[PDB]
Design brief:
Family: Belongs to the pancreatic ribonuclease family.
CATH architecture: Roll
CATH topology: P-30 Protein
EC number: 4.6.1.18
Order of helices and strands: HHEHEEEEEE
Enzyme class: lyase
CATH superfamily: Ribonuclease A-like domain
Shape: globular
Largest sheet: 4 strands, antiparallel
Strand content: 25-35%
Helix content: 10-25%
Strand order of the largest sheet: 2-3-6-7
Radius of gyration: 14 Å
Number of strands: 7
Keywords: Disulfide bond, Endonuclease, Glycation, Glycoprotein, Hydrolase, Lyase, Nuclease, Secreted, Signal
GO cellular component, one term: extracellular region
CATH class: Alpha Beta
Number of domains: 1
Distance between the termini: 32 Å
């Protein structure tokens, strides 16, 4: 039984690589992480930092979420991220993604106890 916290980790964490070097990164990770069942997940972000470092964001800069909520936090520093976005030729079950690597601050929504990231809001 997957919790909100577990789902965030499966969908967004990639501590095992410091960055994505291959144009094929997204294609592989999207499939490995169970993100292409029934439909191709259109957009997804992978974070190349330790789990503890991402969890620490929950006590960082409080910001408004894109939905108007107040339980969003922004990392003080930029972090290693990889953006996966479905291409214009992607067609389920043949999901195709464009891989974009960059250093951005992340914005996550936090909940519970312990207070941890449950949703990936944005990158800036």
């Amino acid at each position: 039984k997957e919790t909100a916290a577990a789902k965030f980790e499966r969908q967004h964490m990639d501590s095992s690589t410091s960055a994505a070097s291959s144009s094929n990164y997204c294609n592989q990770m999207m499939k490995s992480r169970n993100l292409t069942k029934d439909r191709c997940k259109p957009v997804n972000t992978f974070v190349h930092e330790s789990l503890a470092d991402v969890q620490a964001v929950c006590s960082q800069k409080n910001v408004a979420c894109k939905n108007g909520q107040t339980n969003c936090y922004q990392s003080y520093s930029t972090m290693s991220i990889t953006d996966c976005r479905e291409t214009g030729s992607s067609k389920y079950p043949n999901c195709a993604y464009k891989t974009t690597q960059a250093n951005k601050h992340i914005i996550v929504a936090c909940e519970g106890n312990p207070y941890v990231p449950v949703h990936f809001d944005a990158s800036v």
